[PDB]
Scaffold this active site. Sequence first.
Site, short mmCIF file in Angstrom:
data_model
loop_
_atom_site.label_atom_id
_atom_site.label_comp_id
_atom_site.label_asym_id
_atom_site.label_seq_id
_atom_site.Cartn_x
_atom_site.Cartn_y
_atom_site.Cartn_z
CD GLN A 1 -2.61 -1.24 2.60
OE1 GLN A 1 -3.64 -0.57 2.66
NE2 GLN A 1 -2.20 -2.00 3.60
CD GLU A 2 -1.00 4.76 1.77
OE1 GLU A 2 -0.76 3.78 2.49
OE2 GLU A 2 -2.13 5.29 1.69
CG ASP A 3 2.74 4.87 -4.58
OD1 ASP A 3 1.57 4.47 -4.76
OD2 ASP A 3 3.07 6.06 -4.74
CB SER A 4 4.84 -0.59 -0.25
OG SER A 4 5.07 0.43 0.70
CG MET A 5 6.20 -2.11 -5.70
SD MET A 5 7.17 -1.94 -7.20
CE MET A 5 8.56 -1.05 -6.55
#
Lengths: 49, 310, 256, 69, 45, 49
Positions: free
Chosen positions: A2-6
Site C-alpha cells: 500500500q501507498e506505492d510499496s511493493m
Amino acid sequence: NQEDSMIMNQSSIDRGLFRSLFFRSYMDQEKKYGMSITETFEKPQRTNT
Amino acid sequence: RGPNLNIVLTCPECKVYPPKIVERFSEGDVVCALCGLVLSDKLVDRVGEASNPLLDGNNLSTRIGKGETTDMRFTKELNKAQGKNVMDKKDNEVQAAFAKITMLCDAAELPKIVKDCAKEAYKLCHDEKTLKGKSMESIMAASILIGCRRAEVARTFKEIQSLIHVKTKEFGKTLNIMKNILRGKSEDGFLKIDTDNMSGAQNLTYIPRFCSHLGLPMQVTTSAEYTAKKCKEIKEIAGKSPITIAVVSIYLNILLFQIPITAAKVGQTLQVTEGTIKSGYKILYEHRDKLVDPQLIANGVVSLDNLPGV
Amino acid sequence: MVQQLSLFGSIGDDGYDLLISTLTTISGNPPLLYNSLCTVWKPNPSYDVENVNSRNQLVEPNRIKLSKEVPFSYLIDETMMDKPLNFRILKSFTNDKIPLNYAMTRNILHNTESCSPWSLQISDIPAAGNNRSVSMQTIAETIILSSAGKNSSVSSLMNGLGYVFEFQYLTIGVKFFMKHGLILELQKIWQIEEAGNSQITSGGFLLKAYINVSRGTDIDRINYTETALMNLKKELQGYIELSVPDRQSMDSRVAH
Amino acid sequence: MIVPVRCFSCGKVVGDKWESYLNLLQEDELDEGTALSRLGLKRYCCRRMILTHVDLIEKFLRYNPLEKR
Amino acid sequence: TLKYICAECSSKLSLSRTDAVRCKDCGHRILLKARTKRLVQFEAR
Amino acid sequence: KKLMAQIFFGPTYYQRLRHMVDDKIHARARGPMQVLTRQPVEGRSRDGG
Ligand SMILES: [Mg+2]
Ligand SMILES: [Zn+2]
Ligand SMILES: [Zn+2]
Ligand SMILES: [Zn+2]
C-alpha cells in the site's frame, strides 16, 4: 504494497533479481607544501605518527 | 618561558602516564581506553579563506571590488588606499616578485611544485645582506633553477636564459649566493638531505626532455639514459658539460637505432655545436661495449656494427 | 557472581596476641587457623591472543589463580607436633623459613593420577566509583574437583586452557566468623620460589575484613554489608585503622 | 552480462541453455519462440530469462586483460 | 619490493619507495597494484 | 486456496533506482559538533544530526 510499496520475491532476489555492483573510487594525492612539508604514502605506525 | 596554557588530558581514576586515550569522533567523545571513562565530551571536528603561513607569511588582507550596486568613484579612492600604504611595502614587493615567478613559470609551463619551490626559495633568500646588488631578473632565474632542481624537474642555464634575458656571470653568482643562503637556512632551521637534488650535472634528467624534443621512442630514451649513466665511468668525457654528455649519448643511440635525424638537426634542436656532437661521438666510439645497454644486443633490437666508424 | 565487601589493614607481630584477644571479645568466637596455597597462572606469552572475545566486547588478559589448602603436617617442621594447631603457632612464623618449599609445591602441581580439589578464582580490579567507603571486588570462582588421564596434572590442564604458571604464595592465618556473616582474616604470606621463600608480610600480619554477597545487584544487601563493615570500623577505631587499599594494588591484570 | 544460472521466478536452470539457444537461432534458422520451446522453456518467466538476456560478456571480453599470465 | 602491472602493456614490475612510478618497458605512467596472494573468502549467496 | 479475485499477471520492465535504504539510513545519539555554533554537523557521512 500500500501507498506505492511493493512486495518483491525473496527467492528471486536470492537467484539474482536486481542485484547490482557498486563501485566507489577514492582519490588521494601526496603534495609538497614546502621543502620538508611533503605528504607521503606509507603504512603509519602508532609509535611515531 | 611564558604561561603553560596546555591541557594534559589524563584519566583521573586510572592515574596512568602516558594515558591510553581514544578519540571517538563518531560519538563526539574522548574516553580513557583502560576504564571507559569519558574525559571530555562534545568534540569539535567553509567560512574562511586558505592561507599558508610559510609562503606569504602571516599576512591577512582583503581587496576592494565592485559589488551588486557599486559606484565607481568610491572604488577608485579605496583602491588607492591599499596602494598608498607604507607599512607593507616589503610585502607588496615580495608579492610582485611572487607574481613575476608565477608568470615566468606559466610562460615556461612549469608545474605547481616548481612554482612553490621557486617562491619559497625567493622568500628564504629575500632581504639577505649578501643578496642586495644582484639584478632582480637574476634572482628570478636563480630561484626558478633552484625550484626545478628541488622538484627534480631540473632545467639548464640555457633554458632559464631562453626564458629570462640574464647575463651568465651574475646569474651564476646569484645562484651560488642563493645556494649558500638556502644551506644556511637549512642549517638554522629544519635540516634537509640533498640526496642528489642540487647536483650541477643531473644528466639523467635531461635525457627524456631532449628525446621528447627530438621525437625519439621510449626505448631509445632509456638506452640514452643508460649511456649517459655509463659516461660517468669514462674519465675523459666526465669533465664535459651535462648537456653535451646527454646530447652525445642521445646522438649515439640515434645512430644505433637508425633514427633518421642528422647531427646538424640534433644540434639545431638542442643548441649544441655540430662539431661538438661529432667530437663527442668520435670519442665515445672507442667505448662502444660499455655504453651500449647489454640486453638490447642480447635481444637483437640493435647491434654494435650499426654505428659508423671514425 | 559474588562481591567481596572488603577492608584492609596491618598489625605488627607484637600486637598480634592483643588483637586476637580483642577480636575474641568482639565476636565470641575463637580464631581459626587456616592455610591456602594459591598458584597464579597468566596467559601464555607464546600464544597470540585477540583483545576481543566471543562477543564484540574487548577485554584485557587476566591472571587466574588456583587456591587449595595444605595439610599442617607439611607445615610442621618435625619440631612442634606437641603444641596444638591454634593462633599461638603464628608467632613462630616470622622469618622466611617455611617447610613448604618449591620442590614440594611443584610436586603438588604436577601430581607426582587424580588431583586434589582446587578453587579457581578470577578477580578484576575493584570498582572505580569513589562513593563507596569499602573496596568492592568482583570474583568468579569454580571448584575443580578431580582429574584423570595420562595428562592429568593440573599444571598441564592449565596449559591446555592456555595459562602458564607465574608465581605462587602460601598464606597462613587465623579468621573470625563474627556477627552477620563478616569474615575477618589475619594472615602471613610467603612467596614460594625455587630461589627460596620470602616473607612478603615482613614483621607483621595483614588484615582483611570481607563479606561475600551472592547478588551485588541487591543494593540493600550491599548497603547492609557496607554499614556492617563501618560498624566494625567504628568499633575498631583508636587501636587499628581500616582503610581501602589501592585498586592498582588489587588489580590482577597482565600489564603490557 | 552473462546468462543467469537459474530463472528468477521459479529457479529452473537456464544457464546451460544459452549456447544451444544461440545455435538453434543461428544454424537451425528457428525463430526465437520455437527455439525456446525446443529448449523446453514452457513458462514465460523461463522464456523471458533467455529471450531478454543481453549477453554483454563478450563486449567486456573485447578489452585486453589487465593482468595477463 | 611491491608488485605492479602496467596499464596497457601488462608488464610486471617491482617497485620500492625511491623508485619513480613509471613503466620501465613502454614508459607509461599508470600502474595497477597486483592482486593479493592470500585466499579471499566469499559466501556463495 | 484459490483467490476469489483473478490477478492481472505478467512481465513488466522495472528499473532499480539508486536510492537504497542503506545509503539513507542515519541515526545519531551523540557525535561531532560544528566548529562555530557547536551544534551537530550536517551529513550522514559525518555522523551528523
Ligand atoms: Mg512520496
Ligand atoms: Zn581510566
Ligand atoms: Zn521460470
Ligand atoms: Zn608499460
